[PDB]
Design a protein around this ligand. Structure first.
Ligand SMILES: [Cu+2]
Ligand SMILES: [Cu+2]
Ligand SMILES: [Cu+2]
Ligand SMILES: [Cu+2]
Ligand SMILES: [Cu+2]
Ligand SMILES: [Cu+2]
Ligand SMILES: [Cu+2]
Ligand SMILES: [Cu+2]
Ligand SMILES: [Cu+2]
Lengths: 276, 272, 269
C-alpha cells in the first residue's frame, strides 16, 4: 500500500499518431508500462499537449467518476490542460456477506476515451493505449515483460510485417501482456509455448483446472497476460507469434520470440551466406 | 425440488417486434426472467398468439426432443396454437463411473427456433429471447437482476443510444445476465465494476484462479452472468456499460448503470 | 512414456482438396486422430506426395524448431519428399523453484503451415488439418471420439447442409474434439448436451468452478474438447449441433448427434 505519483503526457507523434509518455517528447506506442501492487494508489498528473480533448481511462482498477476519463463524467482534459487522475487498487478479502471480493490484480490497460469520438475511437486508433499490471503479494516477477497490442490489423501500430520481435535466453521467465483494440476479433497464437487461461497464465498447482492453451480468441479491449519459461521443453529458436486468423497472419500480424541458447546463438539463424 | 407451472405467450408487439410475456398484452423484450433451483421442474403452458409458427427453445436445461422447440422434432407451435414445454433441472453428483456430473446451474436463456428460418433468425431478431437463471443450493441471491442482450447491433432491441439504463444504490448486490444473439461478435464492458469469469461471476475464495475481468468477448447464443457490489471501491456515479468494439459503441451500443448514494443522489453527468 | 512411430502422408484429393492419411490413398478431412499419453514421444515419418511444398505443424505439444513445419525454420517438405517430425509430451510437475509446470494434456490439432502461403492458408483451406488428443494419467476414456472442424463456413470441408452426423446409444460416453480454422469466428452449440469449459469438458468434482456451457465462441486455430453421456437427462433424439451465428446455421453449418435407444430406434426420425 504505497502512494505513488507519476507524470504522463499525451502528445501527437509523426504520421498522424498519438501516444502517451513519461516526459514530453518521449511518448511511445504502446504507452509506458505501469506496474502496481494490490493496495497501491497511483496519482497520475496528466497533461494533454494536443490540440484536441484527450483522456486517460483504465480497466480493472478502482477510480471514482472524476477519474472516468469520459465526456459523460466531464473528466477528460482540454487541449493544453492538466488533470490528476487517481487509480486505487485493493487486495482480495472476505466481505461481510460472506463472499470473496476479488482483488485488483491482473493484466489490465489504459487508453483514451475522448479523441475522435466519445469512445476514444480515434485516440485508440492513433496510439493512445498502454499496459497496466497489478500484482498480488507473492506473485512471481519475470526477467522481462513484453507488450503485444493487436490494434485493428496492426501490432503496436507498427507497419505490416514489422514485428515487434522480442529476445530472450532459454530458461528466462518471460512475461507477455496481450491487449486488443479497435474493430476486429483476433486469435493470439504462439509457436512452442503455452500458458494457462487464468489470472497469471500459470497453473497454481495440480488442483487448478484452468485450460492450458496456445491460441486465444480476443476482441476489442480484452487483456490477458502470462509467463513462460523461454524454450521450455522446446529449446532455442525463432518462435513465431501471430494472429491465427489466416488473412491476418498473411497480411503481417506476425512477430518473433527469439530464444537464444545460453551460448548466445539461435538455432538455424543464418542471416549471411558463407563462401563454398 | 419443486414442480412449477407458468403461462407464456408469444405476441407481435404494437411496434412490430415479437415478445414473450407472462400475460396477454404484457410481452416484453427481453422476455420474462425465469428463475429455478436445481431439481425444479417447470411446465410452461405456452400460447402462440401470432399468425406465423413460433416456438420455445432453452439452453442448458434438461428437456426431451418433444420440447426442443424445433421443426426437426415437431415441437414448434402453429399460429394461435398451444403447447406445454417442460424444462427439468438436476443437481450435481457422482456418477457410478466415478466421474462428476455437472448440475444445471448457470446463466441460461430461451428463444424462438422457427420464426423466419428453422433457426429462429427472425424470431430472435424481433425480440423472442429471454433469460433463465438456475441456482445451486447456497448460491448468493441478489437485490436485483438486470438482463442485457446484445442482439445484432441493438441492446434489448432498444434504438441506438437509448439504454437501457439500470438503477441501483451503493452497496446493493446487483446481478447481470448477459446474452448475445444474431450475427456479430461483441465485447461486453462495464466501467467501474469487474467480475470473475466462472459459473457465478464471483470467486469462490482465495484459491479460485479464475480470470477477473471487465471485458468479455461474446458471440451469438453465449450467455454468462455475474453479481457486483454496486459502486464497490468506486462510489456512486453513472457507470457506462457498452460493447467495446469501437464502431458498435459509437453507433449506440451503450447504456448506464446509475449507482446512487443512499440519499438517492448521483454525481452530475451529461448523457448523449 | 512410450516411444511411438507412425507414417503420415499428405495427398491431393478431389475438388482441389488436400488431406493427411495414415496409408497412401487413405487421406481424410479431417486427418487421422492422433492420441498420446503425457510423456509419450511420437516420430511421424511424413511423406509429401503432392507437387507443392507442404508441412506438418502441431499445437500444444513439445517439438524443436526442426519440427516447426515452417519455412522460417526450414522444416517443411519438398514435393515428393519425406521428413521425420518428432513430437514430445510431458506430464505436469513442480519445477525446482516450486512453480507448477503445466502438462501437455489437451485437445490439440495439427495442420499445414506452407501450402498457399507461409501460414498454410491454402493448405488449411483445402483440408490439411486433424486432431491430436494428449491424455493425462487417470483420464476417463470414451466409447467414441468425433471430430468437428469449422473451417471457414464448412464443417470438415463438407458441402452446406451435409452433416456430418454422428451416432451413439443412450448412455455412451462420447468425446467431441472441436477445431476452428480460417477467417471467421463461430459459436459452437449442441442441443440437449452441455460440458464444462475446462480441459476435459467434465468438472473435476464439487470444487471446480468452471462455467458449464452449451455454446462457445471460437476462432481460427482454437481447439477444445469434451465428453458427454449421450442423452443424459434428455433421452434419445436427433440432437442438432450447429454454429449459432444465425446466418451460418441458416446456411448449413448444422449436423446431428443421433442418440438411439438401446433398441436402435430414435424418436420420430
Ligand atoms: Cu468506455
Ligand atoms: Cu487478427
Ligand atoms: Cu477500454
Ligand atoms: Cu438450435
Ligand atoms: Cu458490439
Ligand atoms: Cu440458442
Ligand atoms: Cu504459425
Ligand atoms: Cu459459424
Ligand atoms: Cu495453427
Amino acid at each position: 500500500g504505497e502512494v505513488r505519483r507519476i507524470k504522463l503526457y499525451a502528445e501527437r507523434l509523426a504520421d498522424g499518431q498519438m501516444g502517451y509518455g513519461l516526459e514530453k517528447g518521449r511518448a511511445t506506442i504502446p504507452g509506458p508500462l505501469i506496474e502496481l501492487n494490490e493496495g497501491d494508489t497511483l496519482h497520475i498528473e496528466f497533461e494533454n499537449t494536443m490540440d484536441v480533448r484527450a483522456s486517460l481511462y483504465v480497466h480493472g482498477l478502482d477510480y471514482e467518476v472524476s477519474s472516468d476519463g469520459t465526456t459523460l463524467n466531464k473528466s477528460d482534459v482540454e487541449p493544453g490542460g492538466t488533470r490528476t487522475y487517481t487509480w486505487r487498487t485493493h487486495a482480495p478479502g472476505r466481505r461481510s456477506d460472506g463472499t470473496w471480493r476479488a482483488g485488483s490484480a491482473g493484466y489490465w490497460h489504459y487508453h483514451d476515451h475522448v479523441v475522435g469520438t466519445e469512445h476514444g475511437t480515434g485516440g485508440i486508433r492513433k496510439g493512445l493505449y498502454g499496459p497496466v499490471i497489478v500484482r498480488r503479494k507473492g506473485d512471481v516477477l519475470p526477467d522481462a515483460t513484453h507488450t503485444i497490442v493487436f490494434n485493428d490489423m496492426l501490432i503496436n501500430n507498427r507497419p505490416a510485417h514489422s514485428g515487434p520481435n522480442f529476445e530472450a535466453t532459454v530458461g528466462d521467465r518471460v512475461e507477455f501482456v496481450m491487449i486488443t483494440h479497435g474493430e476486429y476479433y483476433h486469435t493470439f497464437h504462439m509457436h512452442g509455448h503455452r500458458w494457462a487461461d487464468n489470472r497469471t497464465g500459470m497453473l497454481t498447482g495440480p488442483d487448478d483446472p484452468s485450460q492450458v492453451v496456445d491460441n486465444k480468441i480476443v476482441g476489442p479491449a480484452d487483456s490477458f497476460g502470462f509467463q513462460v519459461i523461454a524454450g521450455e521443453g522446446v529449446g532455442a529458436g525463432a518462435w513465431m507469434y501471430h494472429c491465427h486468423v489466416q488473412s491476418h497472419s498473411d497480411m503481417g500480424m506476425v512477430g518473433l520470440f527469439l530464444v537464444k541458447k545460453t551460448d548466445g546463438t539461435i538455432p538455424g539463424y543464418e542471416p549471411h551466406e558463407h563462401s563454398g
